[PDB]
């Protein structure tokens, strides 16, 4: 991924090392362009909802294991180039994997979909889908992105995909697309068991987020209001659709079939109503692109097939593979098994604890083994996760 290494003190040039202003809906960041189309903010994030930048507490927390508030983390310059030197490590783990290089190339590919113009005939950016970034005379240039890395808000831990809406528009659930602002820290990571076991390889925690960015930038991510099944242990709570595709593994059976034959088909007419736009297109707003580039970028994203004409259509089988590979193949069961790491085997294993860590020094955990260091006494029985075997790398938190 990152073609240059980059430092937080590194000279704003305008073009991958900028001051930028997020879609809002104010103070400009500095921000680092790590790969076309990904930008990482190694900030806290104020920014992305109204007044929800406080970084102070409010009136009863969830505590460790479920909440973390220290006002101070991503303040000082060396914390955000290690920031940035963290999610630069985790992106090339990530890109080490046959899968996260697929993935990754498919978040890449994904651009957001052109459908900002009331005119049915007009290819338009969206705004929300785009940053401004600062030139020289302090002017700014829109420009488009698919993903953003940023920094935590209050509760540190709290880990999310989000994205600008639209008055009408569904960006993350009707094909088009939004640019994602994942809300990670590499900086901590989650304790799970099965006396204290082990711990999440943070690579992981972002490949689910990955998998997130993946649903909500092709825009066939499931309403976050779709819950599902009661197969009680032997009075409990329930799991999102979404995040039940995303996890994966044994759990994405508890899944109605004829509820996913449901939406794989949903997503298709979506699809197929993408093909119809641009074929109908006769103008694109902007200086940037053609109407012709534009087509193509989109035919390129949508797996779209070009006739003689040049009539765009959806091939059911390119979709149903493409459909297949991010909802199926992208998951954080089978990015697991990758990475040769230990996982919670479901999302009812109630992590009991935040820990501080530090995977930037490769003598702690590198892009190969991550913390389970070959050559070493970690590389076996994941004792690299072990919390109480690697106590240096793994520091309980209140
Ligand atoms: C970022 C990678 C995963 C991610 N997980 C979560 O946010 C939760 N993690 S969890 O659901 O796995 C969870 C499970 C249990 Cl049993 C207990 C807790 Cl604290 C967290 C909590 C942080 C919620 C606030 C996710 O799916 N976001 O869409
Ligand atoms: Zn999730």
Redesign the pocket.
């Given at each position: 991924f990152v073609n240059k290494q980059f430092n937080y003190k590194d000279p704003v040039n305008g073009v991958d090392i900028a001051y930028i202003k997020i879609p809002n809906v104010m103070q400009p960041v500095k921000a680092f362009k790590i790969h076309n189309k990904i930008w990482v903010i190694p900030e806290r994030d104020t920014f992305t909802n109204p007044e929800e930048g406080d970084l102070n507490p409010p009136p009863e927390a969830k505590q460790v294991?479920?909440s973390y508030y220290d006002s101070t983390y991503l303040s000082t310059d060396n914390e955000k180039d290690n920031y940035l030197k963290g999610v630069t490590k985790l992106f090339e783990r990530i890109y080490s994997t046959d899968l996260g290089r697929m993935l990754l190339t498919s978040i890449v590919r994904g651009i957001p979909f052109w459908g900002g113009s009331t005119i049915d005939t007009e290819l338009k950016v969206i705004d929300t889908n785009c940053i401004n970034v600062i030139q020289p005379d302090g002017s700014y240039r829109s420009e488009e992105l698919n993903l953003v890395i940023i920094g935590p808000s209050a509760?540190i831990?709290?880990?999310?995909?989000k994205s600008f809406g639209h008055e009408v528009l569904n960006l993350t659930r009707n094909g088009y697309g939004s640019t994602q602002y994942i809300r990670?820290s590499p900086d901590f990571t989650?304790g799970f068991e099965e006396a204290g076991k082990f711990a999440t390889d943070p690579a992981v925690?972002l490949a689910?987020?990955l998998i997130?960015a993946g649903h909500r930038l092709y825009g066939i991510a499931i309403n976050p209001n779709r819950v599902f099944k009661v197969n009680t242990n032997a009075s409990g709570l329930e799991v999102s659709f979404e995040?039940l595709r995303?996890?994966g593994g044994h759990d994405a059976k508890f899944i109605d079939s004829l509820q996913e034959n449901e939406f794989r088909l949903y997503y298709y007419n979506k699809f197929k109503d993408i093909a119809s736009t641009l074929n109908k297109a006769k103008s694109i707003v902007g200086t940037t692109a053609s109407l012709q580039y534009m087509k193509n970028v989109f035919k390129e994203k949508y797996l779209l097939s070009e006739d003689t004409s040049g009539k765009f259509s959806v091939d059911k089988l390119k979709f149903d593979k493409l459909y297949k590979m991010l909802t199926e193949i992208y998951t954080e069961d089978n990015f697991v098994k990758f990475f040769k790491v230990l996982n919670?085997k479901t999302?009812?294993?109630?992590?009991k604890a935040v820990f501080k860590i530090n995977i930037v020094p490769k003598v702690n955990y590198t892009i190969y083994d991550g913390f389970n260091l070959r050559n070493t006494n970690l590389a076996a029985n994941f004792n690299g996760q072990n919390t109480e075997i690697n106590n240096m790398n793994f520091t309980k938190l209140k």
């Amino acid at each position: 991924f990152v073609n240059k290494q980059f430092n937080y003190k590194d000279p704003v040039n305008g073009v991958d090392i900028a001051y930028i202003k997020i879609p809002n809906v104010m103070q400009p960041v500095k921000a680092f362009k790590i790969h076309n189309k990904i930008w990482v903010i190694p900030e806290r994030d104020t920014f992305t909802n109204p007044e929800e930048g406080d970084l102070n507490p409010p009136p009863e927390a969830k505590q460790v294991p479920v909440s973390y508030y220290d006002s101070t983390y991503l303040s000082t310059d060396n914390e955000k180039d290690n920031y940035l030197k963290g999610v630069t490590k985790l992106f090339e783990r990530i890109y080490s994997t046959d899968l996260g290089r697929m993935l990754l190339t498919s978040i890449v590919r994904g651009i957001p979909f052109w459908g900002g113009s009331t005119i049915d005939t007009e290819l338009k950016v969206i705004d929300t889908n785009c940053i401004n970034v600062i030139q020289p005379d302090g002017s700014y240039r829109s420009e488009e992105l698919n993903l953003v890395i940023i920094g935590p808000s209050a509760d540190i831990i709290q880990f999310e995909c989000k994205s600008f809406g639209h008055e009408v528009l569904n960006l993350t659930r009707n094909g088009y697309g939004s640019t994602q602002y994942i809300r990670f820290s590499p900086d901590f990571t989650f304790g799970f068991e099965e006396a204290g076991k082990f711990a999440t390889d943070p690579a992981v925690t972002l490949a689910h987020e990955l998998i997130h960015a993946g649903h909500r930038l092709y825009g066939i991510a499931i309403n976050p209001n779709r819950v599902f099944k009661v197969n009680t242990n032997a009075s409990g709570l329930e799991v999102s659709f979404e995040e039940l595709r995303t996890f994966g593994g044994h759990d994405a059976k508890f899944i109605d079939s004829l509820q996913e034959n449901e939406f794989r088909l949903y997503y298709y007419n979506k699809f197929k109503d993408i093909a119809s736009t641009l074929n109908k297109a006769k103008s694109i707003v902007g200086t940037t692109a053609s109407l012709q580039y534009m087509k193509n970028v989109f035919k390129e994203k949508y797996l779209l097939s070009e006739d003689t004409s040049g009539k765009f259509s959806v091939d059911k089988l390119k979709f149903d593979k493409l459909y297949k590979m991010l909802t199926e193949i992208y998951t954080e069961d089978n990015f697991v098994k990758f990475f040769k790491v230990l996982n919670r085997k479901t999302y009812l294993n109630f992590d009991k604890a935040v820990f501080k860590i530090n995977i930037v020094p490769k003598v702690n955990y590198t892009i190969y083994d991550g913390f389970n260091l070959r050559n070493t006494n970690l590389a076996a029985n994941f004792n690299g996760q072990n919390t109480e075997i690697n106590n240096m790398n793994f520091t309980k938190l209140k």
